[PDB]
Design a protein around this motif. Structure first.
Motif, PDB file in Angstrom:
ATOM      1  N   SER C  25       0.826  -1.204   0.000  1.00 21.55           N
ATOM      2  CA  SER C  25       0.000   0.000   0.000  1.00 21.55           C
ATOM      3  C   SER C  25       0.860   1.255   0.000  1.00 21.55           C
ATOM      4  N   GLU C 173     -27.366 -13.073  -4.146  1.00 16.64           N
ATOM      5  CA  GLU C 173     -26.429 -12.650  -3.114  1.00 16.64           C
ATOM      6  C   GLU C 173     -25.028 -12.466  -3.679  1.00 16.64           C
ATOM      7  N   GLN C 218     -41.445  -7.225  -6.581  1.00 16.93           N
ATOM      8  CA  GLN C 218     -41.480  -6.521  -5.305  1.00 16.93           C
ATOM      9  C   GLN C 218     -40.296  -5.576  -5.160  1.00 16.93           C
ATOM     10  N   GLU C 219     -39.203  -5.852  -5.858  1.00 15.64           N
ATOM     11  CA  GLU C 219     -38.009  -5.027  -5.746  1.00 15.64           C
ATOM     12  C   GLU C 219     -37.290  -4.900  -7.085  1.00 15.64           C
TER      13      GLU C 219
END
Lengths: 83, 249, 264, 64, 285
Positions: C25, C173, C218-219
């Protein structure tokens, strides 16, 4: 090297196809915008010419109070009074 | 003029429409006085009557078409309020997000409508939360508005806490996986805020980094570490984080 | 930058994985960036393997900690011996190798091994591992055979008789887009695989589609494809012999049809 | 006298920032409006701050 | 798009990979036909990337510039409201080059295409003339002025295998001319009459000479537009109470004369526009 000839040919073919489709779309845009300008132009022209042939207060407030009273007795469905 | 136009209450054009509605529309759109003739929407979401409410019972389609006109005119806020009157939460949230987007940056605290837009957004969010897809997009857009507010205000600790709790933006390299899930699962009005949410979370990390740096080199290390971890989380992010590591060096 | 990179690269028992990542990093340029990014991917793979080995063996952990391992060594000496299916999926994903049936086996092994490691709890463990691997490999079509994963998992759910939605909620998922999932489901239905007929569950495909689509509602174009596929599966089920499961699937899909119509 | 943190960043404050864009916006407006300004001192100050318009001797306010 | 624009920025900075620049530009323009496409394109700061370096090219290359202008115009046509800001920014940057393109049409096929692209961009921007004049007041005005000048230039050039190449050049000139005509229209009475007269003249010169159908359509559109504009201006002078009644009647008579003559020559050539023109003449008579 017929291969390179073939490939450059196909590439330039794609380039010309895209350039031509582009010019065609551009001309379509120009002509459509032109017809649009013509239609809206006639509309402005007609509103204008109607303004052209047009060239060769307290009272209204009372009339407006009266008209308000009339339509008010109208909406409430009251006996339609004599205007 | 509307008192006069009430007189045409029963008139029908050759196409069957009520002359009353047409005249009222032309007037309200012309006279900048929709608020009086058709009414005005209060903060709670209840319709304050217009004069054109006296002559007819329902003005749903009127409200819809007039909101459409205001949209066409670029009249965002009034279009939001009007569609809000017409009971159309979808368009409401749409315009709310569209406007709240540039509200990421704050300056001239009271002068800019920052306060005004914040109040209107808060009231609309309250309205919808009182009133799963649409509501979740709405409430998440509202929390995103809150996050952008704390970002643009210098409120850093509480908003970073709420960000941690929301699990919408990843603060760890492994949370890359997590980030995808959230950014993939949410609804529209939230994902619309997702971009600025990412930007604000990054810059909050950045100001915490600077305050730490402003033990030093260890602070720069932890900073670039968080930067690269967020990069792995979110292309744009990696370029940004490499750039920040460059600039702080 | 060069120096910290070298320290990150030094094979030494003193420079642990964590200090390696930190030195990274803190670390002609474009190829250098691409090299470092591929390095970071291989590193996430290595850390996954090490963590799994530590929780699930001494020499393997110590060795993967002692120095950087290349793809082939991880695959043959580390990932395969301990049968880390998810790990092999991630590895071949990083290797860009595409082997369809092998990917099938990797997803199926993830599913079954997880279903084992939690001996409802089994299907939940399957959700756990399948998501944990999909979110890693769903981005590299050479190592996540979405079709094969869905097919084998549906076979499993039919085997143990769980909720027909576990496959759909699981795949979602892992952020697999609902449209490509609809394509996978419809294709599996069209193949008329005699297996599902053998298990006397000829509508499991249809119920899976129903759960996916109801969750979706529904979504307009995705809903249009949904209308088409709903009509198609309706015709296919109206062509089958009438069983109670058949007619129930029929009415459920018809309700989804009218619901999507109101949604379109 | 967000512009204050910016000003300090210009003179004194280090202002290490992540994915921020600096000196692109200043030169832009400067070229747009300031480059033609009737305030010699102002345009000179813009040149100094944004590292632009290096051609301009701006000798109206610079004589020695 | 991130890496792409980074590359393009580098390239324009060093002025290399012209083929690369052009191909990428074409790909972008093709993607720009889509709403979401152009949406992200802006979201990439395509302006923030391109606008700055593009100075370098003028300080294939002109082809790349043209394709960029085309993408800008299409982007405006795709998302006018939220993009007008950046569009105006780039224009303020590229203003001088746009003027040069609009002026080069006098002295060359490349000048023609450049003028056509600048004009198309100006047209795409015209749909927001309000904000246009609002921010850049000198711009819209000098634009209208030079646009009148260039429409006149096109009319003058048109009215008066090498034959094939010349005919093609004139056909492209006429297409661009009709575009610029409908453009200045979308924005003295004697000048308007001169425009309409040059329109009928070009129409006769073209119908005599027997790409071309393009010239016919453009000239017809131009005639309609010049009629509309002259009529609107005259109706303004007529309805304006500040214009004296003396000017009203004098203009009425003179315009009635010019319009009777023009509509007569028109009906002679064409043997609702003729009806509208006759009615305007009579109400002006």
């Amino acid at each position: 090297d017929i291969q390179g000839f073939l490939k450059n040919e196909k590439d330039n073919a794609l380039l010309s196809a895209i350039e031509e489709s582009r010019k065609r779309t551009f001309v379509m845009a120009e002509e459509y915008h032109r017809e649009s300008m013509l239609v809206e132009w006639e509309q402005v022209k007609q509103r204008v010419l109607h303004t052209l042939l047009a060239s060769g207060d307290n009272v209204e407030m009372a009339y407006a109070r009266q008209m308000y009273m009339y339509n008010e007795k109208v909406v409430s469905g009251h006996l339609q009074p004599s205007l | 003029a509307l008192q006069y136009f009430y007189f045409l209450r029963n008139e029908k054009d050759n196409q069957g429409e009520s002359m009353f509605l047409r005249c009222v529309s032309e007037l309200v759109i012309e006279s900048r006085e929709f608020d009086m003739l058709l009414g005005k929407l209060e903060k709670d979401g209840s319709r304050k009557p217009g004069a054109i409410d006296k002559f007819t019972r329902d003005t749903k389609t009127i409200i819809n078409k007039v909101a459409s006109v205001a949209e066409n005119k670029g009249l965002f806020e009034e279009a939001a309020k009007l569609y809000d009157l017409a009971k159309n939460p979808d368009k409401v949230l749409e315009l709310t997000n569209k406007l709240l987007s540039p509200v990421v940056s704050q300056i001239s605290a009271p002068q800019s409508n920052r306060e005004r837009l914040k109040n209107m957004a808060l009231a609309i969010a309250e309205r919808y939360k009182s009133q799963k897809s649409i509501n979740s997009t709405f409430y998440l857009l509202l929390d995103l508005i809150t996050f952008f507010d704390e970002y643009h205000a210098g409120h850093i600790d509480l908003s970073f806490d709420v960000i941690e709790r929301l699990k919408l933006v990843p603060l760890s390299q492994d949370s890359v996986e997590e980030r995808v899930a959230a950014f993939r699962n949410f609804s529209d009005e939230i994902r619309h805020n997702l971009s600025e949410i990412l930007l604000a979370t990054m810059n909050i990390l950045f100001t915490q980094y600077k305050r730490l740096k402003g033990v030093q080199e260890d602070k720069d290390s932890v900073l670039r570490s968080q930067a690269r971890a967020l990069i792995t989380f979110a292309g744009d992010t990696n370029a940004r984080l490499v750039q920040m590591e460059v600039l702080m060096n | 930058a060069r120096v910290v990179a070298k320290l990150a690269d030094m094979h030494s028992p003193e420079i642990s994985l964590k200090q390696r990542l930190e030195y990274i990093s803190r670390a002609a340029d474009g190829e250098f960036l691409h090299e470092l990014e591929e390095k970071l991917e291989v590193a996430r793979i290595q850390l996954q393997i090490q963590e799994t080995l530590t929780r699930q063996v001494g020499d393997a952990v110590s060795q993967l900690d002692s120095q950087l391992m290349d793809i082939t060594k991880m695959f043959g000496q580390y990932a395969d011996p301990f049968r880390l299916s998810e790990c092999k999926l991630a590895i071949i994903h990083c290797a860009g190798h595409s082997d369809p049936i092998l990917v099938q086996t990797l997803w199926q092994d993830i599913i079954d091994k997880e279903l084992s490691d939690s001996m409802v709890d089994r299907m939940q463990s399957l959700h756990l591992k399948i998501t944990s691997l999909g979110k890693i490999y769903a981005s590299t079509p050479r190592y996540f055979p979405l079709e094969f994963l869905v097919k084998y998992l549906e076979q499993q759910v039919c085997n143990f008789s769980w909720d027909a939605g576990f496959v759909t909620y699981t795949m979602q998922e892992i952020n697999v887009p609902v449209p490509k999932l609809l394509e996978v489901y419809d294709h599996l239905f069209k193949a008329r695989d005699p297996w599902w007929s053998r298990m006397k569950k000829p509508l499991h495909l249809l119920e899976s589609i129903y759960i996916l689509l109801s969750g979706y509602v529904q979504e307009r174009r995705f809903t249009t494809l949904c209308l088409d596929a709903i009509s198609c599966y309706l015709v296919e089920l109206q062509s089958m012999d009438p069983a109670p499961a058949l007619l129930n699937t029929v009415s459920n899909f018809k309700s989804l049809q009218a619901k999507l119509e109101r949604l379109s | 006298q967000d512009f204050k943190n910016c000003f300090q960043e210009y003179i004194h404050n280090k202002d290490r920032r992540l994915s921020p864009t600096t000196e692109n916006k200043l030169r832009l407006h400067y070229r747009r409006a300031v480059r033609a300004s009737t305030d010699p001192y102002k345009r000179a100050v813009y040149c100094i701050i944004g590292r632009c318009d290096v051609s301009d001797n701006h000798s109206e306010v610079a004589d020695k | 798009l991130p890496i792409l624009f980074s590359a393009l920025e580098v390239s324009l900075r060093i002025k290399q990979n012209l083929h690369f620049c052009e191909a990428i530009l074409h790909f972008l323009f093709t993607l720009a036909k889509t709403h979401q496409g152009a949406a992200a394109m802006a979201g990439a700061g395509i302006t923030q990337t391109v606008c700055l370096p593009l100075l370098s090219v003028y300080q294939s290359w002109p082809g790349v510039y043209r394709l960029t202008v085309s993408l800008m115009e299409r982007l405006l046509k795709t998302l006018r409201y939220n993009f007008l800001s950046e569009a105006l920014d780039f224009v303020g940057v590229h203003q001088e080059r746009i003027l040069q393109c609009l002026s080069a049409v006098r002295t060359s096929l490349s000048c023609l295409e450049e003028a056509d692209h600048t004009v198309g961009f100006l047209l795409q921007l015209s749909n927001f003339t309000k904000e246009w004049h609002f921010h850049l007041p000198q711009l819209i005005k000098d634009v209208q002025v030079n646009l009148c000048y260039l429409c006149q230039a096109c009319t003058s050039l048109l009215h008066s295998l090498e034959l094939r190449q010349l005919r093609t050049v004139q056909h492209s000139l006429l297409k661009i001319l009709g575009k610029t005509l409908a453009t200045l229209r979308a924005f003295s009475f004697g000048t308007l009459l001169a425009t309409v007269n040059v329109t009928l003249s070009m129409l006769g010169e073209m119908d005599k000479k027997k790409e071309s159908k393009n010239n016919k359509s453009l000239l017809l559109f131009i005639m309609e537009n010049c009629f509309y504009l002259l009529i609107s201006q005259a109706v303004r002078y007529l309805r304006d109470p500040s214009v004296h009644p003396r000017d009203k009647q004098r203009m009425k008579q003179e315009l009635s004369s010019e319009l009777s003559t023009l509509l007569s020559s028109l009906s002679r050539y064409f043997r609702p526009l003729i009806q509208l023109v006759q009615a305007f003449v009579r109400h002006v008579q």
